[PDB]
Design a protein around this ligand. Structure first.
Ligand SMILES: Nc1ncnc2c1ncn2[C@@H]1O[C@H](COP(=O)(O)OP(=O)(O)O)[C@@H](O)[C@H]1O
Ligand SMILES: Nc1ncnc2c1ncn2[C@@H]1O[C@H](COP(=O)(O)OP(=O)(O)O)[C@@H](O)[C@H]1O
Ligand SMILES: Nc1ncnc2c1ncn2[C@@H]1O[C@H](COP(=O)(O)OP(=O)(O)O)[C@@H](O)[C@H]1O
Ligand code: BEF
Lengths: 441, 426, 209
């Protein structure tokens, strides 16, 4: 069995569960004559790549409690009588073998919000999860952990002090958090001396944590196919298909490494702005000032504009998210504004990262009246991305790369100098810049 | 018990309903009931935790924690399927106590269990001997003192574990002789009348709650106790044939202690009320309407007993061949508590029965005169001999290859002083 | 166990629910020869997280009478029948041995509006809930108590005088109703005296107990 060493990285979040289950049962004499009991429920939210079933078994095996997993959509049936007692018999089963962990997963179809009022079996399973957990027994034996991929779709009336009222955050593992992940999965079937594990962690940028655990089992299949080395992990890196680049595929995929750029007088400036806070984090805290956030390129189109977008992302250890110009702006009314909303919180959850904005003139018009060049005149999509740059939130390490053709429609509202830092202009390449670009191709 | 683990290895599916109706089998077995299912004894008591905020004791029983209406169905399985005897004279000795005084008797059965091969994954119950407790007996029935006999059956059960014996059943007689010169008995228990009296179901069901059956697939270590109930009543036409039944484990492990009492009718029993001591649910059962069929006709004051008993088959071993019998020496010795009859004796009966037969003659007939059940309980209750000599007396009586164990028995100083104190006494 | 002091933290809505079930029992001689029956059904609503599941257990110790309790969807079992008869088993048991207090919970999931749902069990659960509250000279002993957070989702025929009237609103306590909650679940805890507790009454305001 495995306990408290299954994943590295996010272990202060697992230590919060360690002081929630084990610490009551290790010293129960400290929790009598203290008054108020600890809470009895944790809602673990985040991307559903990690699964959370591998962390909940690490906690339950260390304390010795029972692990009785109940899947999400299996308690819902179309006969409408056993759906409210398949969950009720689970807590009746976990009452005998105290202590025990229930660990209900995928709370989207089960226990939804009653704002829609659609379906009688969906409105009663909220109340069945309601009506028992208030009278659920104390002293930390029938505790429940929740695994849900969206924390804003469950019922807000569910959380009254005792159902799920200890919120914890699980996001994308950062640098020096994915290194301890591959240390666990390579404890058996040891790699040779040629492959380095620290260079392996620089290749993974924004992976879900369980994807690089399956990357080790994929690269080990290449060694039995050869009959593990550095080239076996390199071939399994491109075939892993992470969630950041899963939704878009353009055949065939290209990954370049022999591009450094012939524009060297701005390459040291681009290393100064977005590459120095992600390499030297402690110096910006000892000076007490925020680092550089964004930059904008403008000039002639096709003159190394997209080449600067991919040469920077290959040199930084962060992932690359690219918008396709006027492709996220649909004719439908509402989700055209939401297409800016879902690409920035994904960038903030994958901090640090670099986003690329291209052909700014087709979306902005810079305020222009209530009139439009095509006729839609939707001034709310420019005000939405006006709010997503600074916001009222934590200052993340997100970087934005602006690219446009003509600086006439440049928007003076997107240009406050805290938003974009440098208004640099790219010229046509000269004769000395042309010799540095022919040998690189 | 080694019988429970031997049937777990063999698979025999054995729980087929269409196969057992072909061979005229009512209920399948206990071990094939296990493999189809998670062995939980159904509880009818009130709860004291209740998983909510209401108080447990005064009122406040919610519908998720309430004993529902019992449909009162028969048990679909049996613990044992066939009880087997070992000698026709042990039954003939027990009915001989009725022939001398006319009134009824009572007794406990000693034996073991083994494999039954007619039924798939069935258990057969082999009895070995009959013990008789002290009793006071009338012509209609009998009920002895509770406490003073339970004190007596601790030490004789301590006296029975060295041979490999255990209390497995009980017997009670009900003859009702007609005229004693033109027939044996009447026909008291048949299809029209009662099969088992409700005053004896509470004595049968209480013996199972105190004799638990060890099961590893349960949650408390005990489930579906293995205790047979035998009765000597009589068949239809002219004989005194015996019958053997068992109580249901779904109710009689729980309901007998609180809400089961004896009524005035022999075919029914009186339902009790707790008046806020515990909760007693409603009992549903069926009957036949005069013109059609009814559905749910009676709530409170009626429930039959015959929904609650399962049937068993008795048997006697063949005369030409048998495996072992282990206890045939005379089967005519005076028993323990036949004080109403004349067979309640002292040192005079040892002069008349054996006197260590033909004192210096032989040992082959002596082995067939000392392996009696009530003989070894009597000479150990005198406790003249040493306890290590009494262990040797066990292997010299019920164990095979007794010849080298018998000569080392009589050559000791323990056996010499018994025949010296017997010749001087009467 | 909880009581009237452990539930303390509401004042105006506490005296409305206390005299509804204790005053006809502690003083039954004033209703007699007055011509009016006492009110027979409590329906307390409000925002979630307030003590609408713990008010009923609080006067489910202090009155000293025959408490009960029904959960929301456990009565809904799959039979053609018995989803209405288990409701009848909870009322015909509560009929005898006066007095009587019965608490039904989660009346927003079960018993919805009639013309706003499509389920044949839901047409029979609503009216069996009506008929046991007024049948043919029913409502002689029992006093029902409801608890929900969505009063608009229940049936409009459920809030009548005979079944659910004198409904009490349990709102967010902030005007010296928040401070009374602090003095209840802190007298059992060990508190070293180094600060005052009155400054915490105005620190946050969206707290609901
Ligand atoms: N950071 C991590 N987060 C979650 N699981 C991890 C992590 N690192 C390693 N693992 C392990 O990798 C395996 C893959 O996770 P799991 O949720 O089972 O994947 P999937 O969702 O593909 O079924 C599990 O055994 C898990 O414990
Ligand atoms: N002098 C040059 N400056 C920039 N890119 C050049 C030059 N000569 C050739 N190229 C190449 O031409 C392509 C067009 O440059 P790029 O700005 O990436 O185009 P686009 O704006 O269409 O994406 C790139 O592959 C780039 O490397
Ligand atoms: N007077 C009160 N003021 C504030 N909180 C209270 C009060 N009485 C009970 N509570 C709290 O309410 C919870 C129990 O009832 P609650 O969950 O609010 O019920 P419901 O959600 O059904 O209204 C506990 O957390 C308890 O501390
Ligand atoms: F909060 Be509810 F009344 F259970």
């Amino acid at each position: 069995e495995v306990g408290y060493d299954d994943i590295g990285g996010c272990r202060k979040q697992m230590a919060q569960i360690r002081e929630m289950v084990e610490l009551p049962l290790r010293h129960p004499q400290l929790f009598k004559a203290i008054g108020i009991k600890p809470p009895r429920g944790v809602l673990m939210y985040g991307p559903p790549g990690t699964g959370k079933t591998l962390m909940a078994r690490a906690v339950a095996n260390e304390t010795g409690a029972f692990f009785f997993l109940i899947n999400g959509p299996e308690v819902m049936s179309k006969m409408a009588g056993e759906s409210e007692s398949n969950l009720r018999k689970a807590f009746e089963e976990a009452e005998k073998n105290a202590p025990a962990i229930i660990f209900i997963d995928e709370i989207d179809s089960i226990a939804p919000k009653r704002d829609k009022t659609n379906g009688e079996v969906e409105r009663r399973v909220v109340s069945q999860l309601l009506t028992l957990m208030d009278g659920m027994k104390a002293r930390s034996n029938v505790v429940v952990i929740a695994a849900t991929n969206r924390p804003n779709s469950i019922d807000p009336a569910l959380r009254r002090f005792g159902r799920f009222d200890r919120e914890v955050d699980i996001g994308i593992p950062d640098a020096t958090g994915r290194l301890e992940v591959l240390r666990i999965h390579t404890k058996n079937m040891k790699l040779a001396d040629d492959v380095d594990l620290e260079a392996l962690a620089a290749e993974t940028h924004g992976y879900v944590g369980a994807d690089i655990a399956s990357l080790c089992s994929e690269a080990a299949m290449q060694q039995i196919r050869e009959k593990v080395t550095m080239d076996n992990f390199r071939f399994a890196l491109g075939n892993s298909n992470p969630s950041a680049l899963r939704e878009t595929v353009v055949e065939s995929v290209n990954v370049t490494w022999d591009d450094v750029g012939g524009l060297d007088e701005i390459k040291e400036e681009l290393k100064e702005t977005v590459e120095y806070p992600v390499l030297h984090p402690d110096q910006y805290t000892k000076f007490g000032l925020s680092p550089s956030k964004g930059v904008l390129f403008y000039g002639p189109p096709g003159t190394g504009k997209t080449l600067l977008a991919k040469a920077v992302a290959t040199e930084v250890s962060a992932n690359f998210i690219s918008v396709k110009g006027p492709e996220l702006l649909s004719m439908w009314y509402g989700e055209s504004e939401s297409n800016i909303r879902d690409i920035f919180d994904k960038a903030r959850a994958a901090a640090p990262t670099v986003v690329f904005l291209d052909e700014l003139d087709s979306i902005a018009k810079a305020r222009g009246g209530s009139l439009g060049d095509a006729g839609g005149a939707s001034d709310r999509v420019v005000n939405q991305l006006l709010t997503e740059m600074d916001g009222m939130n934590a200052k993340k390490n997100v970087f934005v790369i602006g690219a446009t053709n003509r600086p006439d429609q440049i928007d003076p509202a997107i240009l406050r100098p805290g938003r974009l830092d440098q208004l640099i202009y790219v010229p046509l390449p000269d004769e000395n810049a042309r010799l540095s670009i022919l040998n690189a191709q | 018990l080694a019988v429970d683990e031997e049937l777990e290895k063999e698979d025999g599916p054995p729980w087929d309903k269409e196969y057992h109706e072909k061979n005229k089998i009512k209920h399948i077995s206990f071990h094939s009931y296990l493999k189809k299912l998670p062995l939980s004894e159904p509880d009818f008591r009130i709860n004291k935790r209740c998983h909510n905020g209401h108080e447990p004791w005064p009122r406040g029983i919610c519908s998720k924690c309430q004993p529902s209406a019992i449909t009162l169905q028969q048990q679909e399985f049996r613990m044992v399927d066939h009880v087997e005897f070992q000698k026709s004279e042990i039954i003939n000795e027990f009915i001989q106590a009725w022939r001398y005084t006319g009134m009824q008797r009572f007794g406990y059965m000693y034996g073991s269990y083994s494999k039954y091969d007619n039924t798939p994954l069935g258990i057969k119950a082999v009895v070995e001997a009959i013990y008789e407790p002290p009793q006071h007996d009338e012509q209609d029935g009998l009920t002895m003192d509770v406490e003073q006999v339970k004190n007596e059956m601790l030490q004789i059960d301590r006296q029975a574990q060295e041979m490999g014996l255990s209390r497995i059943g009980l017997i009670f007689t009900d003859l009702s002789d007609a005229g004693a010169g033109d027939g044996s008995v009447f026909c008291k228990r048949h299809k029209d009348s009662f099969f088992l009296s409700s005053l004896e179901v509470i004595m049968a069901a209480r013996h199972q709650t105190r004799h638990p059956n060890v099961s590893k697939y349960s949650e408390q270590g005990f489930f579906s106790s293995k205790f047979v109930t035998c009765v000597i009543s009589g068949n239809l036409e002219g004989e005194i044939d015996i019958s053997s039944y068992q109580v249901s484990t779904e109710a009689e492990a729980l309901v007998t202690a609180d809400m089961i009492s004896g009524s005035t009718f022999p075919s029914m029993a009186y339902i009790n009320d707790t008046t806020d001591e515990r909760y007693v649910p409603e009992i549903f059962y069926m009957k036949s309407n005069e013109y059609g069929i009814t559905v749910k006709e009676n709530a409170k004051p009626a429930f039959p007993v015959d929904y609650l008993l399962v049937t068993l088959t008795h048997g006697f071993p063949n005369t030409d061949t048998e495996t072992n019998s282990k206890f045939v020496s005379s089967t005519g010795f005076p028993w323990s508590n036949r004080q109403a009859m004349g067979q309640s004796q002292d040192y005079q009966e040892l002069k008349k029965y054996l006197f260590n037969v033909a004192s210096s003659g032989d040992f082959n007939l002596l082995h067939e005169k000392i392996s009696n059940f009530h003989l070894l309980l009597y000479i150990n209750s005198l406790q003249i001999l040493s306890p290590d000599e009494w262990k040797l007396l066990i292997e010299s009586a019920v164990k095979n290859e007794w010849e080298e164990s018998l000569l080392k028995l009589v050559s000791s100083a323990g056996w010499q002083t018994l025949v010296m104190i017997l010749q001087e006494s009467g």
